[PDB]
Amino acid sequence: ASKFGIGQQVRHSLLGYLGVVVDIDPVAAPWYHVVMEDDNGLPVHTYLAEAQLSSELQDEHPEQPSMDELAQTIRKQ
Amino acid sequence: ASKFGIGQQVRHSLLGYLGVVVDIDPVAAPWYHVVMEDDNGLPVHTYLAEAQLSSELQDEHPEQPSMDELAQTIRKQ
Amino acid sequence: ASKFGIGQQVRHSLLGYLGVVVDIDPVAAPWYHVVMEDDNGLPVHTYLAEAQLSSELQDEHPEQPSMDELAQTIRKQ
């Protein structure tokens, strides 16, 4: 029903930014609420169609620790 | 009561970014929740006063299809 | 229980952007929903851990009036 899950680290298929899925909106694919670090590194709330997202393989990002921190935190909230 | 409507394509009166109104907050004008593509092209959730927004005339944006996609989708959700 | 309050002007401890706390998420410190102006000056919704935030001293920002406007408005909504 949903390709990506809440708390999963994802990347923008086009721009390649790192982010975390924080919510999903149903009703052909669903939209995703994802907190995503931009150019500067601001954890910015974005609204992205499922086709704009790709799974992030790595679980550790030393350059972007806050996104690892976010993913772990959300996976419990 | 509200100058702009949910699902309407708008532009930032100053910066000129393209966006879509996704929600409105009442109580002199109201604030708008609008998903708006920035420099890089991230559909970023912004919070803007009514005075910062202008109607977008065009209904078709080949350079920014996701904003057209967003507007149509929201106009049904 | 919470270091920063809703409606308080804050700065990103690292990047130094100006923003306003619009909501707080509990359950070791809490996360903050803060509307924050980026490079271009977009009032962007960001999600920040308490450790990423610092109190903003000044109450008047002539270069960024909308953040002063936001703070005052939210302190009543």
Long-range contacts of the stretch B63-71 (C-beta < 8 A, 24+): B64/B18, B64/B37, B66/A49, B66/A52, B66/B37, B67/B9, B67/B18, B67/B19, B67/B20, B67/B37, B67/B43, B68/B9, B69/A49, B70/A47, B70/B20, B70/B35, B70/B43, B71/B7, B71/B8, B71/B9, B71/B20
Q: Give chain A's domains with CATH numbers.
A: 1-77 (2.30.30.390)
Residue in chain C lying closest to A22 (CA): C47
Residue in chain A lying closest to B37 (CA): A46
At C64, phi and psi to the nearest 5?
Answer: -130, 70
What count of CB pairs under 8 Å joins B to C?
A: 36
C-alpha span between B17 and C6 (Å, rounded): 28
DSSP A5: -
Q: Which helix (H) or strand (E) holds A66?
A: helix A65-74
**Contact in structure between B13 and B52 (CB atoms under 8 Å):** yes
Q: What is the resolution of this structure in A?
A: 2.5
Long-range contacts of the stretch C27-36 (C-beta < 8 A, 24+): C27/A77, C29/C3, C30/C2, C31/A73, C32/C4, C34/C10, C35/B46, C35/B47, C35/C70, C36/A42, C36/C12
Contacts of A42 in chain B (CB under 8 A): none
* Beta carbons within 10 angstroms of residue C69's beta carbon: 17
Task: Out of C25, C39, C48, name the one closest to residue A43 (CB).
Answer: C48
Task: Out of C15, C47, C49, name the one closest to residue A41 (CB).
Answer: C15
